[PDB]
Design a protein around this ligand. Structure first.
Ligand SMILES: CN(CCO)S(=O)(=O)N1Cc2ccc(Cl)cc2[C@H](C(=O)Nc2cncc3ccccc23)C1
Ligand SMILES: CN(CCO)S(=O)(=O)N1Cc2ccc(Cl)cc2[C@H](C(=O)Nc2cncc3ccccc23)C1
Ligand SMILES: [Cl-]
Lengths: 305, 305
C-alpha cells in the first residue's frame, strides 16, 4: 500500500558524473566509455550567449583547453566534436563504471528521474515529467547544467534528458543525449518563453486508476461519455486532448479495476466540475499528472483492494 | 528555481542490498562489512507470526538454513545472532562496496530517503518523514521488508530505518538498525493501529520559507504573534507544538528572507483559519510538512555528496 512519487535508484548514473571546465565556466558532464557528453554552452562567456557562433568559438579550442575531473582524477581530453547542442569530449580512459545504456528521445507526458549535480558531484534525485509545452518543472540552481534525466527499466539506463537552461518563469529546458532540444528552445539568451502549459490527461486517468487499486472509489459515478464529449469538456480546463492511443494504453488498468476508460473519463469530467470538496485522492488535494500508465503498473499491486 | 521532494543519491546504499531467504520467506538484507542485517521475522512461518518466541525459533536454525544472495553470488553464512528485532548474519565475505556509515536513531519530524527493494534488488528511491505517530507514509508491497531509510552527511551514510511491516490503514512501521521499533509497535500478527497523527509545524514553516525564496509571497501579512498564542491555535488544528528550539532552527531562513519566525507563524495562523481560497503554494493545495529546515537550506543551496 501507499503511493509515492518514486525515482529510479541513481547509482548507475552517479558513477558517470564528471566536472567539465572551459576557462571560467564549470558544469557537469556524463562519462560513458571514452566520451564525456556536456552542453556546448560550456565554451561560451555570458556576453557570447546573446548570439553565439558555436562553430567559430569551438574552432579556437584545443583538447587541452577542456579540463575534465572524475572524482579526484584529471582525465585527459584526446578529441572533441559537436553534435547539435552537445559537446562530445573524447578522453583517454574508458569509464570502468559504465552501465548498460541507450540514448532515447521521450515524448511529452513521459516521466523520468533527474540526478541534480554541481561540480560533477550528485546532490539529489527527483522524479519529473516532460510537460506538454516541452519544459520540465525541475529544481535546479546555477551550476546544474549537464545534470541528466533517465529511466532504468530492467538493468539498462535510458538517458533521455540533459539540462541546459532555466527559462524566465523558473521552468527548465534541455536536450536529448544527441543534443536536440525538446521544444522550440535554443541555447541562446533570447526572448524565449514557455508556451501555455496543459495537464497530461492520460497521466491523471492512470493516477485515478492507481487510487482505485489502492482501495478508493469516492470519485466514481454511474455515467459514461463519448471520447469527443470528454475532449470538448477537457480542453475547457486546459487538459491535453485524450487520443485513442491513450485509451488503448489504459486498457490493462481498466481490466484490472473493472472500470472502462470512458467510465473513468466521466469521473474526471465530474472532478473538474465539482472539485474535491475537502477530500483527497492518494494524499493529494490536486489532480496529479506526473505518473504515467506504465509508472502506475510498476508501483501498484497487481491485486485491487 | 523549483522545489521538489528530493531524495539523497542512493548509490552508496544500492551496493549493500542483498536477498535473504529462510525456508519459504524471502526479504531484503543490508550487507555492511561481514554482517548482513535483516528483520528477525524472516525466521517466522505464517503460524509462527501469531505468537513468536524468536529465541526458540532461532535456536532451531543453523547457519546453512539462511540463504544470502548478493547479485548472482551466494554468500556463506558463518554465524548468526539477534539484537532486538534485527537478525545479524555473519558472512564469510566482507562487502567490498561498504561505504563510510553510522547507525543513527531519528526523531519524529526528521526526514530520510528510502531505497525500496524486492529480492535484494533496488526498485526505487523516495523521500519521506517519520510522522509524529512514529509511522511512515511509504510505498511498499509484499517483499519490501528489509528496505532501508538513510541520510547522507558529507560522505557518510547514516542508516536510520529498516522496514518491517504495514499497518491496516496502509501506513508503515519499522525499526532503527539496532532493531528498536519506532513507535509502540511489535513484530507479530496481532491487532495494531497507528495513533492519531499531527502535522509537523516546524516543517510547514520551513516549506513556507522555501515558497518565499521561490517567489510565492501571497500569504505574507503585516501581522505577528506570540509563541503562546500561535501554539493555542496550532493545538486546535492538530499541529505539533512549536518550541523555542524550532524558532532557533528557523533563524537562518528568517534572516535570508527578512521574515521573522513569529511573522511566518501569523501567516500560518491565517492559512489554518481561512484556507488557501483557490490558491496553491509551490504547486500544492495542502500545507506540506515533509521538508525540514535543513532540507530547505540544502536544496536551495546545492549541497553535494
Ligand atoms: C538564467 N540566466 C539569465 C538571467 O539573466 S543566466 O544564469 O544568465 N543563464 C543564461 C543562460 C542562457 C542560455 C543557456 Cl543555454 C544557459 C544559460 C545559463 C542558465 O540558464 N543556467 C541555469 C540552469 N538551470 C538553472 C538555473 C538557475 C538559476 C540560474 C541559472 C540556471 C546561465
Ligand atoms: C497482514 N499482512 C499485511 C498487512 O497489511 S501480512 O502480509 O500477513 N504480514 C503480516 C506481518 C506481521 C508482522 C510483521 Cl513484523 C510483518 C508482517 C508482514 C508485513 O507487514 N509485510 C508488508 C510490509 N509492507 C507492505 C506490505 C504490503 C502488503 C502485504 C504485506 C506487506 C506480512
Ligand atoms: Cl516516450
Amino acid at each position: 500500500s501507499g503511493f509515492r512519487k518514486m525515482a529510479f535508484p541513481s547509482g548507475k548514473v552517479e558513477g558517470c558524473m564528471v566536472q567539465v571546465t572551459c576557462g571560467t565556466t564549470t558544469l557537469n558532464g556524463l562519462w560513458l566509455d571514452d566520451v564525456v557528453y556536456c552542453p556546448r554552452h560550456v565554451i561560451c562567456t555570458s556576453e557570447d550567449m546573446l548570439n553565439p557562433n558555436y562553430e567559430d568559438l569551438l574552432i579556437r579550442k584545443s583538447n587541452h583547453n577542456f579540463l575534465v575531473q572524475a572524482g579526484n582524477v584529471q582525465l585527459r581530453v584526446i578529441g572533441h566534436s559537436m553534435q547539435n547542442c552537445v559537446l562530445k569530449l573524447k578522453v583517454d580512459t574508458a569509464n570502468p563504471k559504465t552501465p548498460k545504456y541507450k540514448f532515447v528521445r521521450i515524448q511529452p507526458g513521459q516521466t523520468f528521474s533527474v540526478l541534480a549535480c554541481y561540480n560533477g558531484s550528485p546532490s539529489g534525485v527527483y522524479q519529473c515529467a516532460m510537460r506538454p509545452n516541452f519544459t520540465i518543472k525541475g529544481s535546479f540552481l546555477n551550476g546544474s547544467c549537464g545534470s541528466v534525466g533517465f529511466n532504468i527499466d530492467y538493468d539498462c539506463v535510458s538517458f533521455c534528458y540533459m539540462h541546459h537552461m532555466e527559462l524566465p518563469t523558473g521552468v527548465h529546458a534541455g536536450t536529448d543525449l544527441e543534443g536536440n532540444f525538446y521544444g522550440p528552445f535554443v541555447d541562446r539568451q533570447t526572448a524565449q518563453a514557455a508556451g501555455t502549459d496543459t495537464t497530461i490527461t492520460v497521466n491523471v486517468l492512470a493516477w485515478l486508476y492507481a487510487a482505485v487499486i489502492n482501495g478508493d472509489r469516492w470519485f466514481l459515478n454511474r455515467f459514461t461519455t463519448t471520447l469527443n464529449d470528454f475532449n470538448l469538456v477537457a480542453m475547457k480546463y486546459n487538459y491535453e486532448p485524450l487520443t485513442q492511443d491513450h485509451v488503448d494504453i489504459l486498457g490493462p488498468l481498466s481490466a484490472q479495476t473493472g472500470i472502462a476508460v470512458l467510465d473513468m473519463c466521466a469521473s474526471l469530467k465530474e472532478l473538474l466540475q465539482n472539485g474535491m470538496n475537502g477530500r483527497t485522492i492518494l494524499g493529494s488535494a490536486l489532480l496529479e499528472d506526473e505518473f504515467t500508465p506504465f509508472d502506475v503498473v510498476r508501483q501498484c499491486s497487481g491485486v485491487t483492494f
